[PDB]
Ligand binder design. Structure first.
Ligand code: ATP
Ligand code: ATP
Ligand code: ATP
Ligand code: ATP
Ligand code: MG
Ligand code: MG
Ligand code: MG
Ligand code: MG
Lengths: 53, 107, 357, 335, 357, 359, 188
């Protein structure tokens, strides 16, 4: 029945980890995301400033 | 008959790793870990503050407890003494110490 | 505020510099009785649809101008003359092609500034690196691009015309062999969704085939829009297996691990260690669960026994190209890097080669 | 198995496999805004549920309880502790209300708007998983609508101050209120003619006439400023919740808006929600609003379904497991 | 046993009279969806947080009541009706404000007795003095308070809205300029710790700048929570230099040495000698190594050539204010000084002005 | 040149080479004389000859016997020439000045070492985990200490000492097993019980609840087969035994438990470093090997500390020997090579030099 | 030497790992100044020559004149307390010890090989110094290909792959006949 479409759908549901890797459930705060993006940005500006010809 | 008894008392694999019986990491892993710890230790011991530098931060006091007690006693004495001889707002006014009348008026 | 435009063979990703994710993502199609992207797909029944970008290279300039127009006006709702624009390009993009991109950006859309960055390079930047080897696998094309100090190494670049679209097609074929019929475009979209939701890369392919034949542990169920229910078994991992064994679709080409290794080997030996320790995966076709572990295993199998191997595959990687651009265009030191309208007026299409490298 | 939906206003309780709850009764206030705050009173409520309403022995049935979105870890831990220690159940489970509502419609992916007596939530859910970062909470619900209706009825010239009178006003709200598709046009229509007017017969046999109030009352859900709140309306919170989710699942969320709870029972609410969400979303986005007739109890229904599935049987927390892990176990076993 | 409560702009210090150190020290914040201090900060994401004391003066009384309740019940685990209570107040605290403090203490918490003391005065008392000039620099505000025989001299008090928080922000700015990124609140906390552990006050700023430009001898390393390591150079001494050169953060104000001098000059000439020979430093922002010596140098540079200058800066100074209270409330002769609850009914809020000075 | 590391326990000496991951030789600290053998050999001949304990509660009290132990360590166990190796020794917290001076004198004059160093056990324990700041709970055979350390400096004013350790736990286990009706009065019986303690004991997370579990079912019961082939069943004794560490009143002691002493030690330190102490509790010593002790300590410390304080208990599986490991690391650092007290320096300053040079 | 001068700067590089890091700094950032005094003056005048290196721990250090002072030792060995002539002077001396007739052929063919010749600018500096030492009319050519770090090996790879080389190998049989002695006749 409809409870069979539901039973077949419930049986299929992935782990929380699986959603996490699929970027459906984030692994960090928007703040932490900001930290990371900032660090990346500064490292990048440094290496680019040093970048050889 | 003894076997089954010994089989009922079997630890979990985790519980064995807890006793440092089963390694939780490869030899190479333990080595890299040791090297890391070592470099950390080196760096920290390099910038290790001095005894005086750690005294001034109030981390560890030099004076014995009795010495401290003597300090906290002498201070209380001098304080009660100095506070029981505390001039009136008028004495300070008259001596140009207080410049405004509104200051400590309600005393 | 600067704009970032990643021109995919399948999907255009567009947005504003400084943002963590693209504001608009839409299929790169042009429909004529003009409709672009989602609207074209909606009107797909009434009119035939054409792909302006095939295998990562722009081939139809009128349609591309249509796509960019839709991007600026319909999707982002901005005036192009008010924003510096960073565009992406494929590895080994021909000189004339990028020249035409620059010319169109300045003359047609009157942007105050623009820049053209290599997709794989942006992918590398998004992870905060300037040296490493990128596997960029999208909808239309797959690349291995080794990069040192921001410079792509052209002689060691590998191009493979096997990507996500091809995997979708293969999945349609094998599902059909199982007995479910998927010939129409709408059915194709359904199969693509099945691929994205249910497919994964087996760590050991033979063992996984044996497991799939031995039991129902791998079987999954998909409910069609008609409410019909279908069961998918080994197709889950046989589909993306094509990346490692292109012979599944009749290609003589080596798999992505072999092309990664070969690309690494074509580079100077001294930087090779740096390349092995920095494998960045980007693009939608790298989103399959288990692909990083399989790549680790294969690269480990090909490389020297003592070589350090590291695969970088963040969950956000499907859009990482764009993210890189988003970071790059928001850096203060990048502001000088832009090609200004005055400079373009002075040097013409030629300036992009000098300014961008 | 038993199924218990612990509402701020109404407790819905019954047996698994049944189409409707056997017992529905006011929660008298131990639960405010969907979260349990008075534990002694809550224990009283659960006792009343087991013994008086359902006439069962708690030790003989696995028990599924519902909880609010963003329910604190300690709170569900206390629920579990009381269920196992006080009532000695052989098994129990704690499910998110919005998730059960979603399951009740045969879905495991979509976005639920759950509006009850005390609190309203937007909960986007993917593969049975609620996405905590994207959940929206709005402290505007049925009770507030009842109060607002009392105020506007006062503007009509009818006096409704007593609690019993409040209950009467609530019934008036349930029977005569509706959500206007276009609020301004409906106001103009209400001012132009008696076409919108309705009559309610009081118990004393007095008859009253209600005009634009019929749609001004639930309009508060879309315009909370009607009661002095600075918060956005339910359509905007639906949109915002959707926007906080990953772009790839966003399409899946738009095509699956499930509405549940008593405060979603207003006629016309689905059409209005459709219009507003269409107005906020991208022009080509497919929008579908799901609002079944059973929605007033759909949460409970979901539980009733879930607890009757064979595959759910492994999911129960057994009394032995609770004995082994304590309150901690609920977090691992239920998700 | 009496209680002692120092209501700081950043940190509340609370404890029992006679104790060497405060039993509880926690940030003075109030959280609403009630939460106080650290617990409010952990849950800071879920609920908005409000600062009841800004620049040393109480502005939000409900929030202050929340802080005091948390202090009595949660932190000290005592019944307020069972203990006389000494509160601290800022220099130049408005009359109505201290009246409200008194009113709330007696009516809301039903204390048997209480007293309100000026922070700088308590700082002076803690060193066993009743005459001298105090520099009390905390989280939100810095004061110079000249005191003669226990009397603060209101006409000569200096207020400077430059303190620890401003220094933390500045350190974030200059470390960011160095290329380590510190924009977030968690990063801000990290920077505060960096400031407390690695910063110091240069005796000669220009010479120290020259040494810093000449070599890496001054550079130090800080280990982030993720175990990543960062380097701090001249920022170590440029940060607290702001106290002497407020122009570093765009302030036109004179430095703390100049305000000390001006405060001393605003006093009657006869007591001036007594002020110069007794500079007591209190508050967290005086904890920088080298600050006493620098202050000695600058004050010597400003004062008459034959004037005796003595800077008193004990290791415990960060809490000396509280300590002073702890001493004061434990003196036998102080027992008469308390405002009794009966006394409060008789005179009302008015009584605090007469009884406490 | 390879340095040596010697951890002088009240019960067990751990000895080995710097740079090694684990001690080469671990043996009981006993000296046997006819009514000379050291350690295991002494234990085997224990019947024939009387035994003396050179180290009691972590502090050296019998120097001749200690010299015998050190000789046995160098020659019999490690097979080295002491004059050919720098030597790092460990000492107990609050070790008297004269005691460490005597250690130095004996090392240089008797064993003719080219260099040596004396380190606090708890400090080395902290170092083995790559830390220089934190609070160590070091519980061995004869004595237990809480030692707070900031930047490598032990804070003497805040050190807590508890004369309740592994041996006392063995005795208590003997007593409670005896109350059950199994007789363990004899020394051999003491050894079997000690093995029982090591194999079957653990620390309950909630002591009362675990007692209730033990009373409710046979689920906690385990079986141990004695050498005589007799089989015994053990229930709550499994967790009642190490509970003594948290409740010393179990053996008639008035002292606070280890969690309370940890808290007190933390409180005796300056408030500013206190946060750093709470986040770095390192457990070391054999008596910390009980499963569940870290979790219990976490719960109790969280219960005593302010509600929002971050608490982290560090208890690696190797912790039983972590002291030694620390020394092994410390003595293997390149930057440590200057830190050694050289024999020339000792010739110049005498026993006095150790105080200045080691801290 | 680079470790020594960086240490003099206030960066501590005592450990072996630190030595490896310094080696990496040398390989990545060092170069040979064409005019050493002028480069010292430029380094003293501005931050233009300064470069930045990020340590593995993420620590960041700044390196200035050490970039060219380090390999300058090759031209001025006295920098490390050696009395020896520099590589240019030893090149010149080597050329002079050869017959005069071949000197022209030697001057026109200076081949540089090995890792320590990888410093940018070393070929140009060598050109300048040798030009300064040689007769005014002598043709000087310095050959320093990018592959030079491995050119030794490369040469071998080529030599052993030549067809005409096939007779040149010392066979196991020949070794059996003559012993270790055979290498002298066969290899030259
Ligand atoms: N979760 C997923 N798992 C597997 N494949 C996915 C997933 N999501 C998207 N894809 C595939 O990725 C492809 C889109 O990738 P991407 O957007 O990187 O391509 P593109 O950039 O448009 O093309 P190109 O890189 O060739 O220019 C689609 O064909 C789709 O089938
Ligand atoms: N037909 C109707 N029209 C309008 N409102 C209705 C109708 N039926 C019920 N309601 C309102 O719905 C509310 C009851 O809904 P429900 O029992 O789902 O809330 P709840 O789940 O107890 O609340 P919460 O989820 O906050 O705990 C009542 O306040 C009632 O006024
Ligand atoms: N060792 C240290 N070195 C430098 N600064 C420190 C040190 N310790 C604390 N601080 C700073 O001192 C400030 C807190 O000082 P204090 O507790 O005296 O302020 P307060 O009394 O709460 O503020 P106010 O006096 O304005 O009410 C914090 O901003 C902190 O960064
Ligand atoms: N797995 C285990 N479980 C419980 N206790 C154990 C375990 N392993 C060893 N022990 C106990 O640890 C003790 C040994 O500790 P250790 O060798 O650290 O003491 P020590 O260093 O000789 O003494 P001190 O530190 O007082 O000088 C023994 O008494 C033993 O009973
Ligand atoms: Mg792409
Ligand atoms: Mg509900
Ligand atoms: Mg203060
Ligand atoms: Mg020990």
């Amino acid at each position: 029945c409809r409870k069979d479409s539901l039973a077949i759908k419930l049986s299929n549901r992935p782990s929380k980890r699986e959603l996490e890797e699929k970027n459906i459930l984030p692994r960090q705060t928007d703040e932490e995301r900001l930290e990371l993006r900032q660090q990346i940005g500064t490292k990048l500006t440094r290496r680019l400033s040093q970048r050889p010809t | 008959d003894s076997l089954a008894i010994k089989l009922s008392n079997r630890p979990s694999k985790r519980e064995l790793e807890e006793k440092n019986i089963l390694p939780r990491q490869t030899d190479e892993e333990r080595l890299e870990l040791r090297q890391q710890i070592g470099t950390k230790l080196t760096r920290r011991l390099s910038q290790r503050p001095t005894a005086e530098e750690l005294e001034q931060r109030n981390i560890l006091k030099p004076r014995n407890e009795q010495e401290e007690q003597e300090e906290k006693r002498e201070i209380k004495r001098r304080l009660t003494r100095k506070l029981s001889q505390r001039p009136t707002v008028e004495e300070l006014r008259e001596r140009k110490i207080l410049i405004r009348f509104s200051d400590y008026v309600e005393v | 505020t600067a704009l970032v435009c990643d021109n995919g063979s399948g999907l255009v990703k567009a947005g504003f510099a400084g943002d963590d994710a693209p504001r608009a993502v839409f299929p790169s199609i042009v429909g004529r009785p003009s409709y672009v992207g989602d609207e074209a797909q909606s009107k797909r029944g009434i009119l035939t649809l054409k792909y302006p970008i095939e295998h990562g290279i722009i081939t139809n300039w009128d349609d591309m101008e249509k796509i960019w127009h839709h991007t600026f006006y319909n999707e982002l709702r901005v005036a192009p003359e008010e924003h510096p624009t960073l565009l992406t390009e494929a590895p080994l993009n021909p000189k004339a092609n990028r020249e035409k991109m620059t010319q169109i950006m300045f003359e047609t859309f009157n942007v105050p500034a623009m820049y053209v960055a290599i997709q794989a390079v942006l992918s590398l930047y998004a992870s905060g690196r300037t040296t490493g080897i990128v596997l960029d696998s999208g909808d239309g094309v797959t690349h291995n691009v080794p990069i040192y100090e921001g410079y792509a190494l052209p002689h060691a670049i590998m191009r493979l015309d096997l990507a996500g679209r091809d995997l979708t097609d293969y999945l349609m074929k094998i599902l059909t062999e199982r007995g479910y019929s998927f010939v129409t475009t709408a059915e194709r979209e359904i199969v693509r969704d099945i691929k994205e939701k249910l497919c994964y890369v087996a760590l050991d392919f033979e063992n996984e085939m044996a497991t799939a034949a031995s039991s129902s542990s791998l079987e999954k169920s998909y409910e069609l829009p008609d409410g019909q229910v279908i069961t998918i078994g080994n197709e889950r991992f046989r589909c993306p297996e094509t990346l490692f064994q292109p012979s599944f679709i009749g290609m003589e080409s080596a798999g992505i691990h072999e092309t990664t290794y070969n690309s690494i080997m074509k580079c100077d030996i001294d930087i090779r260690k740096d390349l092995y320790a920095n494998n960045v995966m980007s693009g939608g076709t790298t989103m399959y669960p288990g692909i990083a572990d399989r790549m680790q295993k294969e690269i480990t199998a090909l490389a020297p026994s003592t070589m350090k191997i590291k695969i970088i595959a963040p969950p956000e990687r499907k859009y990482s190209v764009w993210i890189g651009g988003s970071i790059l265009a928001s850096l203060s030191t990048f502001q000088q890097m832009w090609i200004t309208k005055q400079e373009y007026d002075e040097a013409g299409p030629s300036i992009v080669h000098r300014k961008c490298f």
